[PDB]
Symmetry: C3
Subunit: 90 residues, 3 copies
Protein backbone atom coordinates (compact mmCIF):
# COMPACT_ATOMS: atom_id res chain seq x y z
CA UNK A 1 0.00 0.00 0.00
CA UNK A 2 1.27 3.45 -1.00
CA UNK A 3 1.36 6.46 1.27
CA UNK A 4 -1.42 9.02 0.83
CA UNK A 5 -0.80 12.76 0.75
CA UNK A 6 -2.72 16.01 0.91
CA UNK A 7 -1.31 19.44 0.15
CA UNK A 8 -2.12 23.12 0.57
CA UNK A 9 -0.35 26.41 -0.12
CA UNK A 10 -0.81 30.13 0.41
CA UNK A 11 0.67 33.44 -0.69
CA UNK A 12 3.17 33.95 -3.47
CA UNK A 13 6.44 32.74 -1.88
CA UNK A 14 4.61 30.29 -1.48
CA UNK A 15 4.27 28.50 1.81
CA UNK A 16 3.38 24.81 1.23
CA UNK A 17 2.26 22.11 3.68
CA UNK A 18 2.20 18.43 2.63
CA UNK A 19 0.50 15.90 4.91
CA UNK A 20 1.38 12.21 4.48
CA UNK A 21 -0.64 9.31 5.89
CA UNK A 22 1.68 6.33 6.36
CA UNK A 23 0.20 3.12 7.82
CA UNK A 24 -2.18 5.10 10.03
CA UNK A 25 0.14 7.96 11.04
CA UNK A 26 -0.12 11.45 9.50
CA UNK A 27 2.92 13.75 9.59
CA UNK A 28 3.68 17.06 7.90
CA UNK A 29 6.45 18.58 5.79
CA UNK A 30 6.73 22.36 5.33
CA UNK A 31 8.21 24.79 2.81
CA UNK A 32 8.52 28.52 3.43
CA UNK A 33 11.05 29.44 0.72
CA UNK A 34 14.22 28.06 2.40
CA UNK A 35 14.16 24.27 2.32
CA UNK A 36 11.77 21.55 3.42
CA UNK A 37 11.52 20.79 7.15
CA UNK A 38 9.28 18.68 9.39
CA UNK A 39 6.22 20.35 10.92
CA UNK A 40 4.39 20.06 14.24
CA UNK A 41 1.43 18.03 12.90
CA UNK A 42 1.24 14.41 14.12
CA UNK A 43 -2.19 12.72 14.28
CA UNK A 44 -3.59 9.21 13.70
CA UNK A 45 -5.33 8.49 10.42
CA UNK A 46 -5.33 6.25 7.33
CA UNK A 47 -6.75 8.93 4.98
CA UNK A 48 -6.15 12.71 5.01
CA UNK A 49 -7.41 15.90 3.26
CA UNK A 50 -6.70 19.60 3.96
CA UNK A 51 -7.88 23.13 3.17
CA UNK A 52 -6.57 26.49 4.28
CA UNK A 53 -7.42 30.18 4.04
CA UNK A 54 -5.79 33.50 4.88
CA UNK A 55 -7.04 36.39 6.96
CA UNK A 56 -4.61 39.14 6.07
CA UNK A 57 -1.26 37.39 6.44
CA UNK A 58 -2.47 34.89 9.10
CA UNK A 59 -2.94 31.31 7.87
CA UNK A 60 -5.64 28.95 9.09
CA UNK A 61 -5.27 25.24 8.23
CA UNK A 62 -7.88 22.49 8.64
CA UNK A 63 -6.77 18.86 8.29
CA UNK A 64 -9.35 16.05 8.12
CA UNK A 65 -8.02 12.68 9.35
CA UNK A 66 -10.12 9.55 8.81
CA UNK A 67 -10.00 6.05 10.30
CA UNK A 68 -12.88 3.66 9.69
CA UNK A 69 -15.97 5.86 9.52
CA UNK A 70 -14.54 8.46 11.92
CA UNK A 71 -13.23 11.74 10.49
CA UNK A 72 -11.46 14.07 12.96
CA UNK A 73 -10.81 17.75 12.14
CA UNK A 74 -7.55 19.36 13.30
CA UNK A 75 -7.16 23.15 13.35
CA UNK A 76 -4.11 25.39 13.11
CA UNK A 77 -4.81 29.06 13.89
CA UNK A 78 -1.31 30.32 14.66
CA UNK A 79 -0.90 28.73 18.14
CA UNK A 80 -0.72 24.93 17.99
CA UNK A 81 -3.00 22.21 16.63
CA UNK A 82 -6.41 21.77 18.28
CA UNK A 83 -9.34 19.45 17.64
CA UNK A 84 -12.20 21.00 15.66
CA UNK A 85 -15.98 20.79 15.99
CA UNK A 86 -16.45 18.79 12.75
CA UNK A 87 -18.82 15.83 12.98
CA UNK A 88 -20.13 13.39 10.38
CA UNK A 89 -22.53 10.47 10.91
CA UNK A 90 -21.20 7.76 8.58
CA UNK B 1 -11.18 0.17 5.12
CA UNK B 2 -11.49 3.89 5.91
CA UNK B 3 -13.60 6.66 4.41
CA UNK B 4 -11.91 9.08 1.98
CA UNK B 5 -12.35 12.85 2.19
CA UNK B 6 -11.77 16.00 0.21
CA UNK B 7 -12.14 19.54 1.44
CA UNK B 8 -12.41 23.03 0.05
CA UNK B 9 -12.85 26.49 1.54
CA UNK B 10 -13.50 30.06 0.44
CA UNK B 11 -13.65 33.50 2.02
CA UNK B 12 -12.37 34.56 5.44
CA UNK B 13 -15.21 33.42 7.74
CA UNK B 14 -14.58 30.87 6.14
CA UNK B 15 -16.97 28.61 4.37
CA UNK B 16 -15.85 24.98 4.31
CA UNK B 17 -17.20 21.97 2.41
CA UNK B 18 -16.05 18.45 3.30
CA UNK B 19 -16.97 15.57 0.98
CA UNK B 20 -16.79 11.96 2.22
CA UNK B 21 -16.81 8.82 0.09
CA UNK B 22 -18.23 5.90 2.09
CA UNK B 23 -19.17 2.51 0.60
CA UNK B 24 -19.84 3.83 -2.90
CA UNK B 25 -21.61 7.02 -1.80
CA UNK B 26 -20.29 10.61 -1.50
CA UNK B 27 -21.97 13.06 0.91
CA UNK B 28 -21.17 16.59 2.07
CA UNK B 29 -20.83 18.50 5.33
CA UNK B 30 -20.85 22.30 5.38
CA UNK B 31 -19.52 25.07 7.60
CA UNK B 32 -20.47 28.72 7.04
CA UNK B 33 -19.25 30.08 10.40
CA UNK B 34 -21.89 28.86 12.89
CA UNK B 35 -22.05 25.08 13.05
CA UNK B 36 -21.80 22.06 10.75
CA UNK B 37 -24.74 20.81 8.68
CA UNK B 38 -25.41 18.44 5.78
CA UNK B 39 -25.32 19.84 2.25
CA UNK B 40 -27.11 19.13 -1.00
CA UNK B 41 -24.37 17.05 -2.63
CA UNK B 42 -25.30 13.38 -2.82
CA UNK B 43 -23.76 11.27 -5.60
CA UNK B 44 -22.36 7.76 -6.06
CA UNK B 45 -18.59 7.37 -6.05
CA UNK B 46 -15.68 5.58 -4.35
CA UNK B 47 -13.10 8.39 -4.59
CA UNK B 48 -13.60 12.15 -4.48
CA UNK B 49 -11.66 15.33 -5.13
CA UNK B 50 -12.83 18.95 -5.14
CA UNK B 51 -11.81 22.45 -6.20
CA UNK B 52 -13.63 25.76 -6.02
CA UNK B 53 -13.29 29.39 -7.06
CA UNK B 54 -14.92 32.72 -6.24
CA UNK B 55 -16.16 35.18 -8.84
CA UNK B 56 -16.75 38.23 -6.68
CA UNK B 57 -19.07 36.89 -3.99
CA UNK B 58 -20.35 33.90 -6.02
CA UNK B 59 -18.78 30.49 -5.26
CA UNK B 60 -18.38 27.76 -7.86
CA UNK B 61 -17.53 24.17 -6.83
CA UNK B 62 -16.47 21.17 -8.90
CA UNK B 63 -16.54 17.68 -7.37
CA UNK B 64 -14.86 14.75 -9.15
CA UNK B 65 -16.44 11.39 -8.30
CA UNK B 66 -14.79 8.20 -9.55
CA UNK B 67 -15.81 4.54 -9.61
CA UNK B 68 -13.51 2.03 -11.24
CA UNK B 69 -11.88 4.05 -14.03
CA UNK B 70 -14.88 6.35 -14.61
CA UNK B 71 -14.82 9.91 -13.24
CA UNK B 72 -17.94 12.09 -13.21
CA UNK B 73 -17.73 15.86 -12.57
CA UNK B 74 -20.52 17.57 -10.59
CA UNK B 75 -21.01 21.35 -10.74
CA UNK B 76 -22.32 23.88 -8.25
CA UNK B 77 -22.86 27.38 -9.61
CA UNK B 78 -25.19 29.02 -7.08
CA UNK B 79 -28.33 26.90 -7.53
CA UNK B 80 -28.27 23.11 -7.81
CA UNK B 81 -25.73 20.38 -8.55
CA UNK B 82 -25.46 19.59 -12.27
CA UNK B 83 -23.39 17.03 -14.16
CA UNK B 84 -20.39 18.59 -15.88
CA UNK B 85 -18.59 18.13 -19.17
CA UNK B 86 -15.42 16.50 -17.78
CA UNK B 87 -14.24 13.39 -19.61
CA UNK B 88 -11.00 11.43 -19.43
CA UNK B 89 -9.67 8.38 -21.27
CA UNK B 90 -8.90 5.74 -18.64
CA UNK C 1 -9.61 -0.32 -6.80
CA UNK C 2 -11.18 2.91 -8.07
CA UNK C 3 -8.91 5.51 -9.69
CA UNK C 4 -7.73 8.36 -7.45
CA UNK C 5 -8.02 12.01 -8.46
CA UNK C 6 -6.76 15.43 -7.38
CA UNK C 7 -7.96 18.77 -8.76
CA UNK C 8 -6.81 22.41 -8.71
CA UNK C 9 -8.07 25.59 -10.38
CA UNK C 10 -7.13 29.25 -10.81
CA UNK C 11 -8.40 32.58 -12.09
CA UNK C 12 -12.03 33.34 -12.83
CA UNK C 13 -12.53 31.45 -16.14
CA UNK C 14 -11.33 29.25 -14.35
CA UNK C 15 -8.49 27.07 -15.51
CA UNK C 16 -8.90 23.55 -14.04
CA UNK C 17 -6.42 20.67 -13.83
CA UNK C 18 -7.56 17.19 -12.81
CA UNK C 19 -4.92 14.52 -12.14
CA UNK C 20 -5.84 10.83 -12.18
CA UNK C 21 -3.85 7.94 -10.70
CA UNK C 22 -4.77 4.81 -12.69
CA UNK C 23 -2.69 1.63 -12.28
CA UNK C 24 0.51 3.39 -11.30
CA UNK C 25 0.22 6.08 -13.99
CA UNK C 26 -0.79 9.68 -13.25
CA UNK C 27 -2.16 11.74 -16.15
CA UNK C 28 -3.63 15.21 -16.51
CA UNK C 29 -6.82 16.64 -18.02
CA UNK C 30 -7.10 20.39 -18.59
CA UNK C 31 -9.91 22.94 -18.85
CA UNK C 32 -9.50 26.60 -19.86
CA UNK C 33 -13.08 27.51 -20.81
CA UNK C 34 -13.27 25.96 -24.31
CA UNK C 35 -13.29 22.19 -23.74
CA UNK C 36 -11.30 19.42 -22.05
CA UNK C 37 -7.93 18.25 -23.38
CA UNK C 38 -4.95 16.22 -22.21
CA UNK C 39 -1.98 18.00 -20.65
CA UNK C 40 1.75 17.32 -20.66
CA UNK C 41 1.93 15.75 -17.17
CA UNK C 42 2.88 12.06 -17.21
CA UNK C 43 4.59 10.56 -14.15
CA UNK C 44 4.49 7.27 -12.24
CA UNK C 45 2.55 7.07 -9.01
CA UNK C 46 -0.25 5.33 -7.10
CA UNK C 47 -1.43 8.38 -5.10
CA UNK C 48 -1.66 12.04 -6.16
CA UNK C 49 -2.30 15.41 -4.55
CA UNK C 50 -1.91 18.89 -5.98
CA UNK C 51 -1.66 22.55 -5.02
CA UNK C 52 -1.23 25.64 -7.16
CA UNK C 53 -0.71 29.38 -6.76
CA UNK C 54 -0.57 32.42 -9.05
CA UNK C 55 2.35 34.82 -9.32
CA UNK C 56 0.58 37.66 -11.09
CA UNK C 57 -0.90 35.86 -14.09
CA UNK C 58 1.67 33.03 -14.10
CA UNK C 59 0.51 29.71 -12.63
CA UNK C 60 2.74 27.47 -10.52
CA UNK C 61 1.68 23.88 -9.88
CA UNK C 62 3.08 21.26 -7.49
CA UNK C 63 2.00 17.63 -7.91
CA UNK C 64 2.94 15.12 -5.18
CA UNK C 65 3.11 11.59 -6.62
CA UNK C 66 3.51 8.69 -4.19
CA UNK C 67 4.39 5.01 -4.54
CA UNK C 68 5.23 2.88 -1.52
CA UNK C 69 6.86 5.31 0.93
CA UNK C 70 8.40 7.54 -1.77
CA UNK C 71 6.73 10.86 -2.60
CA UNK C 72 8.08 12.79 -5.60
CA UNK C 73 7.25 16.48 -6.20
CA UNK C 74 6.75 17.65 -9.77
CA UNK C 75 6.90 21.36 -10.54
CA UNK C 76 5.26 23.42 -13.28
CA UNK C 77 6.60 26.97 -13.53
CA UNK C 78 5.79 28.04 -17.07
CA UNK C 79 8.14 25.87 -19.11
CA UNK C 80 8.02 22.12 -18.52
CA UNK C 81 7.63 19.71 -15.61
CA UNK C 82 10.73 19.30 -13.44
CA UNK C 83 11.44 17.35 -10.26
CA UNK C 84 11.16 19.39 -7.08
CA UNK C 85 13.26 19.56 -3.93
CA UNK C 86 10.62 17.82 -1.80
CA UNK C 87 11.81 14.93 0.37
CA UNK C 88 10.36 13.35 3.50
CA UNK C 89 11.19 10.65 6.08
CA UNK C 90 8.85 7.71 5.46
O1 LIG D 1 6.27 25.27 9.86
C1 LIG D 1 5.96 25.85 11.11
C2 LIG D 1 4.51 25.58 11.51
O2 LIG D 1 4.23 26.13 12.77
O3 LIG D 1 3.71 26.19 10.50
C3 LIG D 1 2.29 26.03 10.68
C4 LIG D 1 1.89 24.56 10.75
O4 LIG D 1 2.05 23.95 9.47
C5 LIG D 1 2.71 23.85 11.82
O5 LIG D 1 2.41 22.46 11.84
C6 LIG D 1 4.21 24.08 11.57
O6 LIG D 1 4.99 23.46 12.58
O1 LIG E 1 -11.78 27.77 15.45
C1 LIG E 1 -12.02 26.41 15.15
C2 LIG E 1 -13.26 26.25 14.28
O2 LIG E 1 -14.36 26.93 14.84
O3 LIG E 1 -12.93 26.80 13.01
C3 LIG E 1 -13.98 26.73 12.04
C4 LIG E 1 -14.42 25.29 11.79
O4 LIG E 1 -13.33 24.57 11.21
C5 LIG E 1 -14.81 24.64 13.11
O5 LIG E 1 -15.12 23.27 12.90
C6 LIG E 1 -13.66 24.77 14.11
O6 LIG E 1 -14.03 24.21 15.37
O1 LIG F 1 -24.14 25.07 2.45
C1 LIG F 1 -25.28 25.25 1.62
C2 LIG F 1 -24.99 24.86 0.18
O2 LIG F 1 -25.99 25.33 -0.68
O3 LIG F 1 -23.74 25.46 -0.15
C3 LIG F 1 -23.29 25.21 -1.49
C4 LIG F 1 -23.18 23.71 -1.79
O4 LIG F 1 -22.12 23.15 -1.01
C5 LIG F 1 -24.49 23.02 -1.45
O5 LIG F 1 -24.36 21.61 -1.62
C6 LIG F 1 -24.88 23.34 0.00
O6 LIG F 1 -26.09 22.69 0.35
O1 LIG G 1 -20.69 25.33 -15.92
C1 LIG G 1 -20.28 23.97 -16.03
C2 LIG G 1 -18.89 23.84 -16.65
O2 LIG G 1 -18.84 24.43 -17.92
O3 LIG G 1 -18.01 24.52 -15.75
C3 LIG G 1 -16.63 24.49 -16.14
C4 LIG G 1 -16.13 23.06 -16.24
O4 LIG G 1 -16.17 22.46 -14.94
C5 LIG G 1 -17.00 22.28 -17.21
O5 LIG G 1 -16.59 20.92 -17.28
C6 LIG G 1 -18.46 22.38 -16.78
O6 LIG G 1 -19.29 21.70 -17.72
O1 LIG H 1 -2.73 23.36 -20.62
C1 LIG H 1 -1.40 23.52 -21.08
C2 LIG H 1 -0.38 23.25 -19.98
O2 LIG H 1 0.91 23.63 -20.38
O3 LIG H 1 -0.80 24.01 -18.85
C3 LIG H 1 0.07 23.90 -17.70
C4 LIG H 1 0.27 22.45 -17.25
O4 LIG H 1 -0.94 21.96 -16.67
C5 LIG H 1 0.69 21.60 -18.44
O5 LIG H 1 0.83 20.23 -18.07
C6 LIG H 1 -0.32 21.77 -19.58
O6 LIG H 1 0.00 20.95 -20.70
O1 LIG I 1 11.03 26.01 -8.12
C1 LIG I 1 10.98 24.69 -7.59
C2 LIG I 1 10.82 24.70 -6.08
O2 LIG I 1 11.88 25.40 -5.47
O3 LIG I 1 9.58 25.35 -5.82
C3 LIG I 1 9.23 25.44 -4.43
C4 LIG I 1 9.13 24.06 -3.80
O4 LIG I 1 8.04 23.35 -4.39
C5 LIG I 1 10.44 23.31 -4.01
O5 LIG I 1 10.33 21.98 -3.52
C6 LIG I 1 10.80 23.28 -5.50
O6 LIG I 1 12.06 22.65 -5.68
Amino acid sequence: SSVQTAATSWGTVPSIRVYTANNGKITERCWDGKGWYTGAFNEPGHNVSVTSWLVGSAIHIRVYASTGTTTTEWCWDGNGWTKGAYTATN
